[PDB]
RNA sequence: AAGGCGGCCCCCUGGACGAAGACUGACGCUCAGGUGCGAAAGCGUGGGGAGCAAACAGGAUUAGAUACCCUGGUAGUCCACGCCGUAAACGAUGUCGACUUGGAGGUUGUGCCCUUGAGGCGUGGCUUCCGGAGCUAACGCGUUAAGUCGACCGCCUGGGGA
């Protein structure tokens, strides 16, 4: 429908999941997708190949306002930080910047205790 | 002789990121580490210096 | 981490770039630090164990 | 395969051409210790073959081989508990016996009146593309592209 | 001093150490009783409450599962003023003093020497690893002793009961 050519590849990757959001530069959402939505459930959502796919998806769905260039910005640990990258470039996307923007707090709030399994 | 205002020096002991680099990797003593470490959080306060490569 | 993609470089080298970054600022090892509480009692005996290890 | 590391059998080329590659294809289809009948049921698929497709007898085999023939292949491995399938390139000698090894399986699942008819008309399946043979490599190429992180 | 103490800035304040002389002139060491301090949890009154989390609730696992795992979550964890007086409060090693081969570091003073954008030679305080004699049941300890001696104190006298 309308147009912006320039954007921003918004990843959120967690252990358990993979949350792709293809925003513009001022960080209004244009489109998304996650590895959970696309068909794959506990063992087989937290994998890269359902991160991968969760790229694909969402670069289908944003080429409506026709993105051309686009950067990325890396948030957590787990599968799908370089998978999502690798299926964004390959969809035919030109990679501006890749940015780490993991939360790393300066020492605050009391994580929950250790798993004992 | 370390200062805070000599954001010029400062600038060689702190990493990409913002973060004061170890004396294991800048070889400084110890005594001028710890006097580096105050004068980088001094400049960081006084905003003559970042706390982080976002901003 | 940030890294800017240069002119004529491949998307394989400009990744490779931003991975190294990572693993220079240790990011995903701040993570793994973070996500469990560790008593200081833990964090004492850890750094204790580690500096035995760090004589060879 | 521990400790011994061996090399590979050198089997006597084709009675008919002198192929060694069509030796491998006989022994893939012999059954029973039969190679009198394995090379009969070879011959004869390659005769109907040939001859229903412009002659190149050994070319026709080629063209239906080339279709087969895998790239990438995935090996199972178990890390921390997990299997993980590490995508791993194949060797051009096991290009062949994997390619050869799909066409007489595809060709035994068929419903045909003779072996020789139901190789034959996999070969035909094989030089167009479309048959259960195919569809192996085709199968092994989605797994092969979808764990391509794990390579 | 032990408990313990970690962003940055100031104010109030305790101890340690070094260099050079001057001053007092045994004023010292140890300490039953006594006094003070003393992690966390807990208690009282009033605040505060983001995260975490006894109890409790729900979802799972399991033969059962009053657990481990998950979703929640109250006290509590935070502040003021009181209380409590205990810990594997550990170096499981009381304090003070004198004496007894060495090696490699770390940290913090200070005397000296050089044309120094560093090093060379000493001399104190603290600290880590290794090790000699000696010691030890062995493990190990080994000038920061568990070695060689002295002063004073605390304590032990088979296991369970306690
Ligand atoms: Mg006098
Ligand atoms: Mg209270
Ligand atoms: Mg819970
Ligand atoms: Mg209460
Ligand atoms: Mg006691
Ligand atoms: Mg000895
Ligand atoms: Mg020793
Ligand atoms: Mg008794």
């Known amino acids: ?117 | 002789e370390i200062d805070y205002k000599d954001i010029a020096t400062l600038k060689n002991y702190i990493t990409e990121s913002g973060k004061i680099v170890p004396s294991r990797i800048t070889g400084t003593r110890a005594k001028y580490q710890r006097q580096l470490a105050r004068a980088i959080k001094r400049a960081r306060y006084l905003s003559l210096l970042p706390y982080t490569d976002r901003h | 981490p940030v890294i800017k993609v240069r002119e004529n470089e491949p998307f394989d080298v400009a990744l490779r770039r931003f991975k190294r970054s990572c693993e220079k600022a240790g990011v995903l090892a701040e993570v793994r630090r973070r996500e469990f509480y560790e008593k200081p009692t833990t964090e004492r005996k850890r750094a204790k164990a580690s500096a035995v290890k760090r004589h060879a | 395969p521990r400790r011994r590391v061996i090399g590979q059998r050198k089997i006597l080329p084709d009675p008919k051409f002198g192929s060694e590659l069509l030796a491998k294809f006989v022994n893939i289809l012999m059954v029973d210790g039969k190679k009198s009948t394995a090379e009969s049921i070879v011959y004869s698929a390659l005769e109907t073959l040939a001859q229903r497709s412009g002659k190149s007898e050994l070319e026709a085999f080629e063209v239906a081989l080339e279709n087969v023939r895998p790239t990438v292949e995935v090996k199972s491995r178990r890390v921390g508990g997990s299997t993980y399938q590490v995508p791993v390139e194949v060797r051009p000698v096991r290009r062949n016996a994997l390619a050869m090894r799909w066409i007489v399986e595809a060709a035994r699942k068929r419903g045909d009146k003779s072996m020789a008819l139901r190789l034959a008309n996999e070969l035909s399946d094989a030089a167009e593309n479309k048959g259960t043979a195919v569809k192996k490599r085709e199968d092994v190429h989605r797994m092969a592209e979808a764990n391509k992180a794990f390579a």
């Open chain 1, 1 to 117: 429908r309308k147009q912006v050519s320039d954007g921003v590849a918004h990843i959120h990757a967690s252990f358990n999941n993979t949350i792709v959001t293809i925003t513009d530069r001022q960080g209004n959402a244009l489109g998304w997708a996650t590895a959970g939505g696309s068909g794959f459930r506990g063992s087989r959502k937290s994998t890269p190949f359902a991160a991968q796919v969760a790229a694909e998806r969402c670069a289908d769905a944003v080429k409506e306002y026709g993105i051309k260039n686009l950067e990325v910005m890396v948030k957590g640990p787990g599968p799908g930080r370089e998978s999502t990258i690798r299926a964004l470039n390959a969809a035919g996307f030109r990679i501006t910047n890749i940015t780490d923007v993991t939360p790393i707090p300066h020492n605050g709030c009391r994580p929950p205790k250790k798993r004992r399994v």
